[PDB]
Amino acid sequence: SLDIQVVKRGILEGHSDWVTSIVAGFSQKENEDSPVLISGSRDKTVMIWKLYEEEQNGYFGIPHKALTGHNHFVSDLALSQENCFAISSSWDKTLRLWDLRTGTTYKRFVGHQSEVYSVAFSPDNRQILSAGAEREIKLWNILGECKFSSAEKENHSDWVSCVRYSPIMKSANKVQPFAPYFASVGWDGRLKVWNTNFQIRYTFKAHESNVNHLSISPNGKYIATGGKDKKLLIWDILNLTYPQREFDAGSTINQIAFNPKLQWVAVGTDQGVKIFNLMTQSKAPVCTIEAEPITKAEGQKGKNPQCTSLAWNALGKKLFAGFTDGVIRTFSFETSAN
């Protein structure tokens, strides 16, 4: 057997409610580690984390700056390439541009109506993409002006849950055969793929229930898609009649994340976090349920927390899961191969 076992790293706490979004630093000079962690939660707060080198006590790190601009929950965060800037989606019908050194909000994006579930940052950093319960995807100048809004003929029924982008690697030698696209996942169970011009390129009806999250392989060759459908769908951008691969992950799918290198898929689920190996065909490579540190409070027992977010650090060695109890948990992997 190839055993992939998990060593517990630590605990990042002080998020009052849920942990809805997590982003880790971009690798700046190549193959070097990311010092930076940012989370977003219900709690009305964006947390900036200063990380311990080793682990002291049971903790992996300590809260550095708490960004407060927001009325309702923070749905999703995204980083600039600079790593010096972050952005916040919210149910408060607004987006925010955050300087990461100062607590300062730079500009805020207004003009969304209902509420905002996700945001994406384009590789050029001059385009912001935002989506919400308006069944609408919006394109913003970094100066805070709505540039475009996808219309009825294209846009999908119910709510856009998540929008993301299609990485173009640095070297041209990294083999980019396709066109640039952006992907939109929804509560109608539709995975959409649009060109830069906001023209529908490929819209497949992926799921039977609703889709909470979508992420793209670092290669931009495949898409991972998931929600209440209790199914993890992997799609080849070459042949779409049939989904590339499918996995059964217990109960409901909250988040999905590709290992920036390692070629695994980590899935945030109510039961816990599952990790899939794409290199072999088997259905459950590493499974983590987490008992509650808040349960250690005397007399109160948990049903377990459910994990509301995932992120990998740039090196792909560390993994962060945001939870129901407002605690981020950190885990590392040791390989024992028989």
Which residues inside 152-191 make contact with RNA, applying CB under 7 A? none
Where on the phi/psi map is residue 86: left (φ > 0), alpha (ψ -120 to 50), or beta? beta
316 binds, among RNA, another protein, none (CB under 5 to 8 A by kind): none
Q: Are 257 and 265 in contact (CB under 8 A)?
A: yes
- Give whichever of 190 and 276 is closer to another protein, judged by the CB atom: 190
Stretch that binds RNA, among 63-71, 173-181, 214-222, 293-301 (CB under 7 A): 63-71
Pick 209 or 263: Cβ nearer another protein: 209
Please give the Cα distance from 40 to 16 (Å, whole number). 10
Strand duo 273-277 + 264-269: pairing: antiparallel
The binding site for another protein (CB under 8 A) comprises 14, 47-48, 50, 62-66, 73, 103, 115, 133, 158, 187, 200-205, 209-210, 228, 237-241
Q: How many CB atoms lie within 10 A of CB 55?
A: 14
The item of another protein, RNA, none sharing an interface with residue 245, based on CB under 5 to 8 Å by kind, is none
Question: At residue 211, what is the residue type?
Answer: V
Distance in angstroms (rounded) separating the CA atoms of residues 113 and 94: 8
Q: Could you say whether residue 92 binds RNA (CB under 7 A)?
A: yes
Q: Residue 114 gets which letter from DSSP?
A: S
Cβ 209 to another protein shortest distance, Å:
6
112 touches RNA (CB under 7 A): no
Q: Is residue 68 at the binding interface for RNA, with CB under 7 A as the rule? A: yes
Do the Cβ atoms of 40 and 76 come closer than 8 Å? yes
Structure tokens given for 94: 């607004």
Tell me whether residue 21 or residue 184 sits nearer to RNA (CB atom).
Answer: 21
130/155 with CB nearer RNA = 130
Among 69, 243, 272, 322, binds RNA (CB under 7 A): 69
- Which is closer to another protein, CB of 210 or CB of 330? 210
Contacts of 17 (CB under 8 A, 6+ apart): 41, 42, 43, 73, 326
Q: Which does 94 bind (CB under 5 to 8 A by kind): RNA, another protein, none?
A: RNA
* Residues found near RNA in the complex (CB under 7 A): 68-71, 92, 94, 108, 110
